Every structure is written in structure tokens, then in C-alpha cells.
Amino acid sequence: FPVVLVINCGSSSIKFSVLDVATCDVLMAGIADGMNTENAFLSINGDKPINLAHSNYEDALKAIAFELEKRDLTDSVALIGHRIVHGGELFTQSVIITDEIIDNIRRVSPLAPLHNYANLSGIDAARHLFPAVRQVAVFDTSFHQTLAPEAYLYGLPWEYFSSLGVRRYGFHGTSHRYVSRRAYELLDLDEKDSGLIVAHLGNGASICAVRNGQSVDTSMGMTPLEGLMMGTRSGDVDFGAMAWIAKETGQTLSDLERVVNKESGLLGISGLSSDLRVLEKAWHEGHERARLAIKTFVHRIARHIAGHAASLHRLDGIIFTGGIGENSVLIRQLVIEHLGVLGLTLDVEMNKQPNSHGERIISANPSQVICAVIPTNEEKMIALDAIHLGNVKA
Amino acid sequence: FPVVLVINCGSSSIKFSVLDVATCDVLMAGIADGMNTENAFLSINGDKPINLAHSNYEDALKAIAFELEKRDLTDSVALIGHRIVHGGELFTQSVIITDEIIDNIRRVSPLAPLHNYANLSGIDAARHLFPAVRQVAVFDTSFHQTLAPEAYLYGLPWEYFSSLGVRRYGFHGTSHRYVSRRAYELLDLDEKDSGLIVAHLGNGASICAVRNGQSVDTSMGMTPLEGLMMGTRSGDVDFGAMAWIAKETGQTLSDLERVVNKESGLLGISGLSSDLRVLEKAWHEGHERARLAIKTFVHRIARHIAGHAASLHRLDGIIFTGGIGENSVLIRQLVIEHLGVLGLTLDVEMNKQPNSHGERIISANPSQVICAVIPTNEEKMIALDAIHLGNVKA
Ligand SMILES: Nc1ncnc2c1ncn2[C@@H]1O[C@H](COP(=O)(O)OP(=O)(O)NP(=O)(O)O)[C@@H](O)[C@H]1O
Ligand SMILES: Nc1ncnc2c1ncn2[C@@H]1O[C@H](COP(=O)(O)OP(=O)(O)NP(=O)(O)O)[C@@H](O)[C@H]1O
Numbered sequence: 001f002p003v004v005l006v007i008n009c010g011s012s013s014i015k016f017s018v019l020d021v022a023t024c025d026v027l028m029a030g031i032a033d034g035m036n037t038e039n040a041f042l043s044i045n046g047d048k049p050i051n052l053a054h055s056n057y058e059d060a061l062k063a064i065a066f067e068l069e070k071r072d073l074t075d076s077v078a079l080i081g082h083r084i085v086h087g088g089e090l091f092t093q094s095v096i097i098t099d100e101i102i103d104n105i106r107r108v109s110p111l112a113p114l115h116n117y118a119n120l121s122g123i124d125a126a127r128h129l130f131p132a133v134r135q136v137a138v139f140d141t142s143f144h145q146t147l148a149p150e151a152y153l154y155g156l157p158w159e160y161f162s163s164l165g166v167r168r169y170g171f172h173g174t175s176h177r178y179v180s181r182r183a184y185e186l187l188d189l190d191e192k193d194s195g196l197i198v199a200h201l202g203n204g205a206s207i208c209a210v211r212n213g214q215s216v217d218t219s220m221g222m223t224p225l226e227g228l229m230m231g232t233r234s235g236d237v238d239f240g241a242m243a244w245i246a247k248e249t250g251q252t253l254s255d256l257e258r259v260v261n262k263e264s265g266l267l268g269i270s271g272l273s274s275d276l277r278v279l280e281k282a283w284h285e286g287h288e289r290a291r292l293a294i295k296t297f298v299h300r301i302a303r304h305i306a307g308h309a310a311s312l313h314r315l316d317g318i319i320f321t322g323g324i325g326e327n328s329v330l331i332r333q334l335v336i337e338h339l340g341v342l343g344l345t346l347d348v349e350m351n352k353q354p355n356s357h358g359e360r361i362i363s364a365n366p367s368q369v370i371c372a373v374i375p376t377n378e379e380k381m382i383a384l385d386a387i388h389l390g391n392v393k394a
Numbered sequence: 395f396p397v398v399l400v401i402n403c404g405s406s407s408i409k410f411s412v413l414d415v416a417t418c419d420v421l422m423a424g425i426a427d428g429m430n431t432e433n434a435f436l437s438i439n440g441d442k443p444i445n446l447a448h449s450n451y452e453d454a455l456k457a458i459a460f461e462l463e464k465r466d467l468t469d470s471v472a473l474i475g476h477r478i479v480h481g482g483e484l485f486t487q488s489v490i491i492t493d494e495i496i497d498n499i500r501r502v503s504p505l506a507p508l509h510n511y512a513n514l515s516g517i518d519a520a521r522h523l524f525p526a527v528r529q530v531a532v533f534d535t536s537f538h539q540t541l542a543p544e545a546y547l548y549g550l551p552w553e554y555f556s557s558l559g560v561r562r563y564g565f566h567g568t569s570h571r572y573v574s575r576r577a578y579e580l581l582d583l584d585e586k587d588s589g590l591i592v593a594h595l596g597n598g599a600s601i602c603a604v605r606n607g608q609s610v611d612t613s614m615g616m617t618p619l620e621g622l623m624m625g626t627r628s629g630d631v632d633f634g635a636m637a638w639i640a641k642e643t644g645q646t647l648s649d650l651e652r653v654v655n656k657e658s659g660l661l662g663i664s665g666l667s668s669d670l671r672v673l674e675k676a677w678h679e680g681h682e683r684a685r686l687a688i689k690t691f692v693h694r695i696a697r698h699i700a701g702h703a704a705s706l707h708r709l710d711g712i713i714f715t716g717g718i719g720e721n722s723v724l725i726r727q728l729v730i731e732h733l734g735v736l737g738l739t740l741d742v743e744m745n746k747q748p749n750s751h752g753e754r755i756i757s758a759n760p761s762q763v764i765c766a767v768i769p770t771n772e773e774k775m776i777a778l779d780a781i782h783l784g785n786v787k788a
Contacts, residue, residue, distance in 0.1 A: 110642075111638075148689075149686050149689070149690070150686070150689035150690045150692065150693040151693055153663060153686065153690050154628065154631050154632070154635065155623035155624075155627070155628040155629050155631070155658050155659040155660075155662060155663065155690065155694075156628055156631065156639075156653070156654070156658050156662055156663075157653065157657055157658060157662040157663075158662065158663055158664075158665055158683060160639060164639070164642060164643075166635055166638075166639060168632070195735070217697070220632075221631075221632030221634065221635055222632050222634060222635040222638065223632055223634030223635060223638065224634070225632060225633055225634040226630075226632035226633070226634065226635075229549035230549075233549070234548065234549040234550055234633065235549050236620075236630055237548050237549070237550065237615075237633050238548070238562070238614075238615030238616050238617055238619060238620035239619055239620070239628065239631050239633065239636055239650075239651070239654055240615065240616060240617030240618070240619040240620065240651070240654075241548065241560055241615055241616040241617060241620075242633055242636075242647075243647050243648070243650070243651045244505075244560075244616065244617065245550075245554060245558070245560060246647045247647075248504075248558060249558075252647075253636075253637050253640045253641075253646075253647050254637070256633075256637070257633070257634070257637045259550070259551065260550070260633055260634075263551055264549050264550050264551060265549040266549075268549060268550055268551040268552065269547060269549065269550075269551075269552055270552075271552055289552060292543050292544070292547065295542075295543070295544035296543070296544045296547050296549065298544065299544040299545055299704075299705075300549075302704040303611070303701040303702070303704050303705075304701065305704070306700045306701050306703055306704040307697040307698065307700050307701030307704075308697075309700055309735050310693075310696040310697050310699070310700040310701075310732055310733060310735060311693075311697075312735050313734055313735065314734075314735065315735055338704055339704060340707055340708075341589070341703050341704060341706050341707065341708065341709055
């Protein structure tokens with residue numbers, strides 16, 4: 001009964017899952033959190049929250065490894081999959097990790113210095129702990145490497161692209177890929193003759209247009225700040241406005257980078273929370289800024305969905321996914337009603353079904369475009385790539 | 395035979411036109427250029443280019459006034475219309491200029507400190523030169539003051555909106571308004587039950603969605619930098635990319651503001667020119683960056699057109715205007731072919747007609763949406779507002 005260990009290291013945490021190679025079912029999950037804070041801690045579901053204290057990434061993972069040793073899983077770990085944020089232009093698909101891959105991850109890392117160095121720390125820790133286990137790197141950008149230059153270039157001087165690698169990359173790739181593949185089955189579409197828009201709505205949010213199986217446009221940019229307005233992230237913002245705000249309040253670009261990442265979006269408009277459920281309850285109570293935050297979020301989603309459709313020869317389906325997309329009855333219906341121009345018709349009773357209903361069609365018969373909810377599973381997609389790669393002679 | 399004098403002051407120039415109140419035909423036009431440079435000059439069509447030297451805005455306009463005195467037009471000037479860039483939230487329609495209006499223009503001017511102070515200098519000069527002539531202010535933002543909060547808010551902290559007036563304003567308003575009114579006649583639409591997208595493509599470029607006669611979305615932002623990629627302007631750019639570029643090249647936000655306004659867009663990608671005709675000839679010769687600049691420009695136009703359609707209940711027409719929209723056979727066909735997802739069909743022979751053909755339908759019968767070219771005339775729209783206001787008791 002081989003398993004895959006899936007690791008996702010952030011700057012403050014290590015999330016992990018252990019998946020059965022048979023069913024790609026989760027057998028165990030957990031989080032080493034408060035990483036590189038005075039008090040780091042390991043929590044496994046479904047168990048009690050262990051404490052870790054002064055622990056580096058290798059320490060946390062050794063603790064995780066000892067939790068697996070405890071449960072007699074160590075010898076079943078046949079593959080390790082690592083989530084890497086940014087693969088630049090170098091990675092167009094998931095890979096077996098070797099010294100070359102590592103060097104190439106380092107070379108692109110200046111494009112996402114928060115995220116990527118934590119991801120590389122996870123790799124270094126895992127290679128130490130599991131040296132006779134094949135490990136794979138799955139990149140949140142790779143799916144989008146099929147964008148044409150007209151879709152990835154910014155209107156900046158060519159030198160920024162050609163010397164510095166400034167271009168749109170896009171993120172959520174692993175989700176957009178997994179969900180689009182699920183959609184061909186659910187909607188009974190020919191992958192090679194098809195047009196989808198995926199809306200990954202979570203605390204991070206992005207749109208991806210998938211044409212004949214390939215990403216051809218996406219809403220995030222060189223970084224995850226561009227595009228949709230999100231939980232604490234601004235999404236698209238007029239650079240002139242930002243320059244005007246700098247000159248007017250005396251803020252540096254660094255202050256502003258913090259504002260636009262951590263103090264903006266649903267949190268920034270509402271003055272209340274980044275959490276959609278708090279805002280829906282607040283609107284329901286009369287709170288006007290909550291309502292504005294939500295309408296604004298909706299309006300920007302619709303604007304991006306329709307704009308991404310421009311990269312399709314034909315629009316077959318629109319697919320909601322992510323924590324919001326999967327769970328928000330209200331956000332889906334408001335978006336879909338904002339897209340009446342595309343001939344969409346919602347089946348409201350199907351829209352009201354909770355997410356326990358999994359992969360499901362929420363558009364009514366007369367709809368010109370099929371609308372659906374497909375739960376995303378980045379761990380499973382990571383495992384699947386690892387299992388495919390486990391057949392390869394490296 | 396009364397006339398309207400129309401004034402447009404920029405930071406380096408004063409453009410003017412004299413229009414017949416009968417026909418709104420242009421009787422004379424000209425430009426005092428090189429303003430506040432060592433060598434300022436007055437050029438009238440169809441005459442020889444006079445020189446001005448060390449001339450302030452009042453000096454240039456006195457020269458213009460003396461040109462009218464020469465031609466016995468002085469006593470026919472019944473109205474003066476001024477083009478004002480930015481009206482903030484204060485101006486929702488054109489107004490008779492009074493001391494109050496002036497004070498309110500000053501109060502919004504910090505939102506566009508280049509443009510607005512030149513516009514106010516034109517007003518001060520004209521009021522001095524023409525004190526018993528009614529003068530009117532027409533604002534490039536006013537048409538867009540019908541945007542709902544969900545469409546104008548940025549995903550920034552509420553305080554930036556509520557204390558500083560940071561929101562989308564949009565520009566080209568006078569063009570979008572003029573062209574949309576022309577479209578109801580050309581397309582035989584009921585203004586009150588209608589959906590249009592106007593694409594104003596010039597050296598500055600923007601989209602506006604007009605729903606039942608009112609602007610409901612537009613592509614420029616707090617400033618004219620947001621939205622479409624343009625001649626020298628970036629259009630939408632990931633704030634994270636911009637912050638990354640600052641940290642990586644040591645540029646200040648001020649350096650970057652210059653880059654994104656003057657060194658970007660078609661000029662920045664092509665490395666050649668901001669001028670579409672130079673780039674079309676360059677592509678035709680084999681130049682790959684010219685082709686990329688143009689494809690990128692096209693792709694962003696299509697993306698914005700489709701995204702603006704989301705704010706319509708129904709899409710009746712798409713209207714091209716501006717120097718590019720009116721003259722570029724190629725750019726129109728590439729955009730329209732990028733919008734096949736909306737069911738558009740081009741009539742290529744009608745698309746090839748030059749702009750001498752004026753208001754004209756370029757879509758073929760089976761098209762789901764009517765496509766047209768409507769030449770813009772901001773001077774005429776300015777005159778018309780002035781003529782209406784000339785009936786008012788102030
Ligand atoms: N029942 C619900 N109704 C509305 N929103 C919900 C519900 N359940 C979860 N959410 C929201 O979903 C968001 C979190 O989604 P999330 O779990 O982040 O997907 P995610 O993709 O893992 N994040 P990211 O990976 O950066 O996209 C929060 O706003 C939650 O409030
Ligand atoms: N025959 C042509 N083919 C292609 N482009 C043309 C042609 N004629 C003019 N243009 C382009 O139109 C652009 C200038 O348009 P313009 O005269 O700026 O409209 P405009 O709106 O007055 N500018 P703005 O007011 O800021 O929008 C330049 O790129 C020109 O090269």
C-alpha cells in the first residue's frame with residue numbers, strides 16, 4: 001500500500017497530506033504552523049496539537065516524519081510531491097527533482113522570494129529525510145506556460161521582459177489544470193475542441209481560460225496580486241492611483257506593497273474581515289460596506305470571466321471552484337446574474353445544493369453556457385503527477 | 395452668425411477650434427504649441443506658422459484672440475467651451491463657468507495636477523479676454539459619474555476612497571458620450587433599452603460600456619494610465635511587478651511613473667514608435683516586435699471589450715472611434731476576430747472603406763452584435779453643450 005507524501009511550505013507553515021496511491025484518498029493531514037516564530041507547533045488531523053518551539057524547516061519535517069514513523073507509514077512513502085509557487089519560464093510541467101531542477105528553482109526564485117525559498121527549504125529537508133524516495137516538483141505557474149506572448153506581455157519596455165523576465169505568469173495552475181480535466185468528464189466535452197473558464201475563488205482568486213485543454217489567459221500576473229480583488233489582496237489597481245497615493249501620503253512602494261497584499265480587497269473595503277462568511281452575515285445585518293465589498297468582488301469576477309472568454313473560439317462552460325466557488329451559493333448566483341449578457345441561466349435549486357454534492361451542474365437547460373461547481377484537489381493533482389512520474393527511468 | 399470658441403489647454407499647448415453655431419462646422423482651428431518652452435509658436439490652419447517666444451497662456455490666447463480680431467470673428471464669439479480633464483465627483487454634467495465652478499475645479503485639480511492647472515490657466519486667460527461672453531466647462535470624467543460603486547471602487551482600504559477620492563473616474567467621456575448618441579441613430583436603437591460598447595482608440599485609448607444611455611463601466615482609472623495598453627502608456631500592470639521592478643533596478647515610483655506613461659505601450663514593446671502606422675508598416679516588413687506590440691494591443695482591447703460587456707443586460711453594438719478606431723482597417727478586423735466568442739461577423743469589404751465614409755456599419759448580417767465606426771468629434775460635443783447652456787438664465 002504505497003503512499004505519496006505531499007508537502008506545501010509557506011513562509012510561516014508546512015502543510016502536508018499523505019495520500020494512498022490506490023485511491024488518491026487522504027490518509028493523514030496536518031500543519032507545522034508558526035514556523036520561524038518563537039513558538040512553532042505540529043497539528044495532525046485527527047489528533048491533539050503538538051508543540052515545536054524554535055524549529056527550522058528541517059526540524060518541523062523531522063517531527064512530521066516521526067509522526068509517520070509512529071504510524072508505520074515511513075516505509076510506505078514511495079513518492080514525495082512538493083508544491084512550488086513559481087517556475088518562471090523554465091518549467092512547463094511537473095518534474096522529478098534532481099540537482100539540476102533544484103538549481104533551476106533557485107534561478108527563478110527571485111521572481112517570488114517569499115514563497116520560493118520556503119518551497120526550496122521543504123525540498124532540502126525532504127531530500128535529507130527521504131533520500132531513497134523519488135521526489136517531484138509541481139509548479140503553480142506551469143499550466144499557464146501555454147499563454148501566447150500577446151497574453152503574457154505587459155505594455156512595459158521590452159527590456160523588462162527580455163532581461164528581467166517581467167511577464168504574466170499566473171497562479172493556481174494546479175487547480176485550474178485539475179478542474180479543467182474534471183470538467184471535460186462532467187460536461188462531456190471533447191478536450192481538444194472546447195472552451196472553458198475556470199474561476200478559482202478562494203482567499204486567493206483567479207480566472208483561467210482553457211481552450212482545447214490549454215491555458216490561454218489567466219488573471220494573476222507576474223505575481224499573485226494582479227487580477228480579481230481577493231480576501232486581502234487589491235487585484236487590479238491603476239498604477240497612477242498608486243503613484244498618486246505615494247506622493248500624497250508619503251508612503252514608499254514597500255509600504256504600498258504591504259497595503260495592497262495584506263490590508264486590501266474584501267478586508268479593505270469592508271473594514272471588517274477577509275472572510276466571505278463574515279461579510280455575508282454582516283450584509284444580512286445591514287452592513288453597507290460589507291455589501292459594497294461583496295458587490296465589488298462580484299463585479300470584478302464577472303468582468304474577468306467575460307474578458308477571459310475573449311481568448312476562446314467558443315464558450316462551453318464556466319466552472320466555479322475554491323473555498324468560495326465551492327461553498328458560496330450567493331457569490332455564484334450574483335456572478336452568473338452579472339453574466340446574462342453571455343446567455344447564462346441558473347438553476348437556483350441546483351445552485352443551493354451544498355458542496356457535499358461535489359461535481360455538479362448548476363445551470364438550467366436553456367443556458368447558452370454550462371455552469372458547474374467542481375471541487376478542486378491540488379493534493380490529488382500533485383499525487384497524480386507524482387504517480388505518473390514514478391514510472392519514469394530518471 | 396454666432397460662433398463657439400473651443401479651447402483645449404495642455405501642459406505644452408493650446409488647441410482651439412471655432413465652430414459655427416449653425417452647422418457646428420469648424421471655421422478655423424489652430425494650436426499655440428511649445429507653450430512654456432523658450433520658443434512658443436502659433437499655427438492656424440490654413441495659414442503660415444507664427445512664432446511667440448516667451449509666452450504664457452494668457453499671451454498665447456491673446457495672440458489667438460488677435461487672429462480672430464483680424465478675421466472679424468471677435469464679435470461673433472457668443473460662447474467659449476473649455477475642455478477640462480478631471481471633474482472628480484463634483485461634476486456630473488457640463489456647466490456654465492462662474493466663480494463657484496472655478497473654485498470646484500481647483501478643489502479636484504490635485505487628482506490631475508498636470509492637466510487641470512493648464513485647463514484652469516485657459517479659463518483664466520479666456521475670462522480676461524472675453525468677459526461678456528458666457529463660458530462653459532466640459533469635463534472628460536463627467537459621463538462616467540453614473541458608474542455604480544461596485545464598478546468604481548478599487549480593492550484598497552476604504553479610507554483611500556472616503557478621505558482621498560481614490561476611485562475609478564475614467565476619461566474620454568466627451569467622446570464616449572458623443573459616439574454613443576450617434577450610435578442610437580446609426581443603429582436605430584432605443585437609447586433607453588440598449589447596450590453598447592464604445593472603443594475609443596487613439597494615442598490614448600479606452601473602453602466604455604453604455605447601458606440605456608449611461609456609462610456603467612470604463613477602462614481608464616483614477617488616472618488615464620489604467621486599462622488598455624496605448625501608444626506610450628502601459629495600461630493595466632501588476633502592482634507586484636512594478637514593486638519588483640523598483641527593488642530590482644533601484645527605480646523610484648517617480649521614475650516608474652514616467653516609464654509607464656512615456657516609454658511604454660506600443661513604443662515600449664516595439665522599440666520603434668507609438669504610431670500605429672509605423673508599426674503596421676514595420677510588421678509588414680518582417681519586424682517581430684512591431685507585430686507583438688500590435689497583437690498585444692489587440693488582445694488587451696478584446697479582453698476589455700468583452701469584460702465591459704458584463705455590465706450590459708444585452709449587447710447591441712460595438713463602436714470603434716478615435717484615430718485608430720476610425721482609420722485602422724487591420725486593428726478593427728483583428729479585434730473583431732478576437733471576439734468570435736460574442737458571435738460577431740465582419741463584412742470585410744465594409745471594414746476596408748476609409749474614414750471618408752464616416753458613420754458606417756462594418757458587421758455582416760448574421761453578426762450577433764452590430765459593429766460600427768463612428769467618427770468622434772469632441773469639439774462638436776463641447777459646442778453642443780455650450781449651445782444648450784447658452785439658453786439658460788445663469
Ligand atoms: N460556506 C461558505 N460561504 C462562503 N464562503 C466560504 C464558505 N466556506 C469557505 N468560504 C470562503 O472561502 C475562502 C477561503 O477559501 P480557500 O479555502 O482559501 O480556497 P483556497 O484556494 O485554498 N485559497 P488559495 O489557495 O490562495 O486560492 C474564505 O473567504 C472563506 O470564508
Ligand atoms: N490610417 C491609419 N491607420 C492606423 N492608425 C492611424 C491611422 N491614422 C491615424 N492613426 C493612429 O491614430 C493614433 C492617433 O489617434 P488620435 O488622433 O490620438 O485620436 P485621439 O483620441 O485624438 N488621442 P486621445 O484624445 O488621447 O484618445 C496614432 O497611432 C495614429 O498613428
